[PDB]
Amino acid sequence: ITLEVPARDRSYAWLLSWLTRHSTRTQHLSVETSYLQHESGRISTKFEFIPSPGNHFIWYQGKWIRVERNRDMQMVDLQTGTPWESVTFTALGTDRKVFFNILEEARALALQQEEGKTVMYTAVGSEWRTFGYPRRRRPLDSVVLQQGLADRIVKDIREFIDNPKWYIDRGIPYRRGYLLYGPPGCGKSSFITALAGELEHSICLLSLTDSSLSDDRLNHLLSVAPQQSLVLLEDVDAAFLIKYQGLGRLTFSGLLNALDGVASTEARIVFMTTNYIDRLDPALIRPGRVDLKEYVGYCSHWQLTQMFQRFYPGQAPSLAENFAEHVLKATSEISPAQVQGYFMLYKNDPMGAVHNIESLRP
Amino acid sequence: ITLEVPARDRSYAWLLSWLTRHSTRTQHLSVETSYLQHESGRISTKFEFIPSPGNHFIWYQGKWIRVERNRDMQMVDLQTGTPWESVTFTALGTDRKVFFNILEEARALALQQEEGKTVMYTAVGSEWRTFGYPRRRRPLDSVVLQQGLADRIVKDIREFIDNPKWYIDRGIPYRRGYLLYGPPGCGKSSFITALAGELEHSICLLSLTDSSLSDDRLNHLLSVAPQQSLVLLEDVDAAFLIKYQGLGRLTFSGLLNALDGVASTEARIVFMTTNYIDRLDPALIRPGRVDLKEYVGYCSHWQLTQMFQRFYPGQAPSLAENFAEHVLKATSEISPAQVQGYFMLYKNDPMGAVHNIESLRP
Numbered sequence: 001i002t003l004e005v006p007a008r009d010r011s012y013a014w015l016l017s018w019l020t021r022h023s024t025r026t027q028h029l030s031v032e033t034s035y036l037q038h039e040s041g042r043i044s045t046k047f048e049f050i051p052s053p054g055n056h057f058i059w060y061q062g063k064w065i066r067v068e069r070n071r072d073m074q075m076v077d078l079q080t081g082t083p084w085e086s087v088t089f090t091a092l093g094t095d096r097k098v099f100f101n102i103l104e105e106a107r108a109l110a111l112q113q114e115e116g117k118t119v120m121y122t123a124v125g126s127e128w129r130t131f132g133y134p135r136r137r138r139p140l141d142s143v144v145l146q147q148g149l150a151d152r153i154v155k156d157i158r159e160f161i162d163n164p165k166w167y168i169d170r171g172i173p174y175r176r177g178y179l180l181y182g183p184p185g186c187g188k189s190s191f192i193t194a195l196a197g198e199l200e201h202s203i204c205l206l207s208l209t210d211s212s213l214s215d216d217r218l219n220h221l222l223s224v225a226p227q228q229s230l231v232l233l234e235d236v237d238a239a240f241l242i243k244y245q246g247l248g249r250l251t252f253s254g255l256l257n258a259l260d261g262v263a264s265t266e267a268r269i270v271f272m273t274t275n276y277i278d279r280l281d282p283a284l285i286r287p288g289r290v291d292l293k294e295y296v297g298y299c300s301h302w303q304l305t306q307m308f309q310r311f312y313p314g315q316a317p318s319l320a321e322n323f324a325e326h327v328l329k330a331t332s333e334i335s336p337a338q339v340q341g342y343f344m345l346y347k348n349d350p351m352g353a354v355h356n357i358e359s360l361r362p
Numbered sequence: 363i364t365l366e367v368p369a370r371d372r373s374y375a376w377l378l379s380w381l382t383r384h385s386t387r388t389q390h391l392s393v394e395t396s397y398l399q400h401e402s403g404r405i406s407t408k409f410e411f412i413p414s415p416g417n418h419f420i421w422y423q424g425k426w427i428r429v430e431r432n433r434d435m436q437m438v439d440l441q442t443g444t445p446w447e448s449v450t451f452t453a454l455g456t457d458r459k460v461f462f463n464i465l466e467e468a469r470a471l472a473l474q475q476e477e478g479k480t481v482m483y484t485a486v487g488s489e490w491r492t493f494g495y496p497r498r499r500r501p502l503d504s505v506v507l508q509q510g511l512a513d514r515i516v517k518d519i520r521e522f523i524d525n526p527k528w529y530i531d532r533g534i535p536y537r538r539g540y541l542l543y544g545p546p547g548c549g550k551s552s553f554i555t556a557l558a559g560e561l562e563h564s565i566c567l568l569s570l571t572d573s574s575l576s577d578d579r580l581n582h583l584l585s586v587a588p589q590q591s592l593v594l595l596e597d598v599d600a601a602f603l604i605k606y607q608g609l610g611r612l613t614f615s616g617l618l619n620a621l622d623g624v625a626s627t628e629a630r631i632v633f634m635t636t637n638y639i640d641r642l643d644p645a646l647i648r649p650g651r652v653d654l655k656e657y658v659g660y661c662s663h664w665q666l667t668q669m670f671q672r673f674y675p676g677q678a679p680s681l682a683e684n685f686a687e688h689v690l691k692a693t694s695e696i697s698p699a700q701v702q703g704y705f706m707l708y709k710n711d712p713m714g715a716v717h718n719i720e721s722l723r724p
């Protein structure tokens with residue numbers, strides 16, 4: 001008779017979600033307490049009732065079905081670092097089309113739960129797991145970069161995603177990589193978040209300086225990356241000097257051969273972020289691994305004008321021009337974050353913002 | 363009565379494949395979720411239904427057969443680092459020819475699944491395992507090397523494979539090795555992939571700087587390498603200085619005696635790749651271990667001409683000559699990867715490619 005055993009690998013989440021959502025008559029429940037991010041930032045705790053071992057029964061269209069958890073917890077391993085957490089579906093039939101159907105429905109509901117939000121994955125051992133809960137999509141119009149830099153990057157990445165046949169009919173690998181660099185507090189990580197929210201993509205964070213990251217495990221992680229997901233390497237310069245400086249068993253050649261080597265996977269987009277670009281070996285930022293280097297730097301006239309128009313909507317452009325001129329006359333280099341803080345002091349008080357410029361001259 | 367116990371060693375894969383393919387009436391299934399690389403790069407997730415413990419039955423020609431998995435998971439070891447994963451075939455006969463027949467059929471189907479693709483193996487402990495899924499065979503006409511370098515290597519390796527009797531009638535060992543060296547971004551790994559795809563061979567990656575690689579384990583791995591497979595050592599210079607610099611318990615003499623020693627195996631082809639050749643000890647690149655050193659270097663006139671003809675098919679040769687002349691006049695040394703990126707900017711716009719050459723002068 002029909003029987004299915006998920007095995008707890010890159011599928012467990014979706015089936016748990018469906019189990020909770022559809023049944024509504026189940027017993028042997030549990031308590032999963034977590035945070036929920038309501039509108040207006042006022043978080044509140046929330047309970048999800050999820051299975052616990054013993055026999056659970058569900059009536060979905062057609063025949064009765066018996067689902068179950070078989071957690072005979074012998075877990076001497078890091079493969080889960082928790083009980084093995086099997087699951088079981090079964091039913092008194094021998095036409096296994098309906099089981100395939102229910103699982104695909106679970107996939108559909110899972111991918112539909114995140115409609116206007118941004119998932120963040122993370123590395124658990126050598127697999128990708130959800131991390132926390134869906135975040136709020138930071139709009140892309142609220143990250144003011146230099147004149148004609150966000151449009152360039154967005155256009156290039158869109159062109160990359162909507163021309164896969166041009167890469168195959170010439171034998172090139174279907175990969176790409178980007179590198180944002182510049183001083184501290186200038187718009188790298190925020191732009192990455194906004195870009196991920198504009199392309200309906202997700203994010204997958206990867207911390208090289210981590211105690212459980214061998215070259216083989218890294219080569220396996222980037223190959224099993226979720227579909228339609230940006231991978232991200234934050235501060236890749238702090239990992240190497242052509243010599244490792246972190247806790248772990250990762251080398252330089254392993255990284256260089258995992259990004260672009262002989263057994264690298266297709267349809268992958270990697271971002272890197274660094275503050276200092278002189279400490280990066282030229283064998284890691286050459287074309288093939290990193291096809292677009294961009295410098296997100298200190299503010300200029302246009303940036304300050306646009307930031308002023310963002311914070312105080314409903315003012316004449318003359319006031320914004322006055323602000324930009326005064327600030328850029330006062331101090332030579334000023335990052336957008338300092339300007340953000342300065343506006344954070346004067347909420348809904350544009351005149352006071354234009355009057356108290358002299359507090360920025362360090 | 364007839365009974366067989368695979369023992370989970372260099373055979374498990376093929377029997378699992380046959381179990382899935384032929385039965386179609388099995389129960390106690392499972393869920394193996396993975397990626398599938400359709401045409402046009404648009405990957406999609408995919409499910410394979412594979413066995414799970416309990417009794418499975420199959421009707422293959424002749425007599426009924428009872429197959430089974432006996433996973434009584436006690437796994438305190440790295441020999442599998444997972445449950446022991448036995449398998450069992452059995453049948454009410456005493457003529458053990460048919461079992462041999464079914465296993466050979468499984469081997470046939472397994473070797474036939476990969477028809478126009480390239481397998482990549484990897485090192486799991488001290489055995490070779492499949493890694494991911496079959497890749498797409500990069501054509502050899504899309505890797506433009508110097509004038510008469512790919513033909514030379516391909517001809518030498520073909521002559522090696524099609525004259526095994528000349529090596530035995532003179533007592534020489536039936537081994538060979540190659541070494542590609544040169545600057546970064548000049549065509550080493552890509553050429554290795556193309557060459558493996560042209561000879562219907564496979565690839566077996568080996569990372570020396572790995573935490574679980576003793577000299578004995580290495581001597582055992584290269585002896586149990588799959589049939590018709592290139593072995594590959596990427597960045598062999600970063601492992602030694604005549605002193606180890608990696609995580610592991612590997613030495614120099616162990617490597618030198620594993621490649622060519624007293625207990626080295628026959629019918630083996632090894633590739634090495636390095637950027638710096640001066641840091642290699644002359645006792646590792648002398649003849650016997652490495653019989654052909656080649657320098658894949660910066661571009662020249664002919665390379666640029668051929669690359670232009672590859673990217674923009676259907677243009678007059680005059681335009682390609684103009685491009686090559688202008689680029690080689692602009693900058694002294696330019697690698698093929700920079701040229702690839704420059705063409706990646708101007709898609710299907712040859713005139714713009716010939717006009718915007720000056721953007722390469724650094």
Ligand SMILES: Nc1ncnc2c1ncn2[C@@H]1O[C@H](COP(=O)(O)OP(=O)(O)OP(O)(O)=S)[C@@H](O)[C@H]1O
Nearest residue numbers: 142143144145184185186187188189190336337340
């Ligand atoms: N162009 C910009 N427009 C709006 N806010 C910006 C801009 N650039 C930076 N910021 C502000 O910078 C803050 C954080 O930006 P980040 O991208 O994290 O800076 P950063 O480069 O990561 O600095 P480090 O090195 O990580 S401490 C946020 O509060 C943003 O509001």
Ligand SMILES: Nc1ncnc2c1ncn2[C@@H]1O[C@H](COP(=O)(O)OP(=O)(O)OP(O)(O)=S)[C@@H](O)[C@H]1O
Nearest residue numbers: 283288505506507546547548549550551552698699
């Ligand atoms: N002769 C060539 N023809 C076409 N593409 C080439 C050629 N040489 C290099 N490339 C490009 O180089 C890229 C990677 O080639 P690789 O062989 O990996 O370079 P590499 O020598 O491995 O550099 P490192 O040291 O590993 S960063 C691919 O995108 C190729 O298109």
Ligand SMILES: [Mg+2]
Nearest residue numbers: 188189190273
């Ligand atoms: Mg940051």
Ligand SMILES: [Mg+2]
Nearest residue numbers: 260261550551
């Ligand atoms: Mg390489």
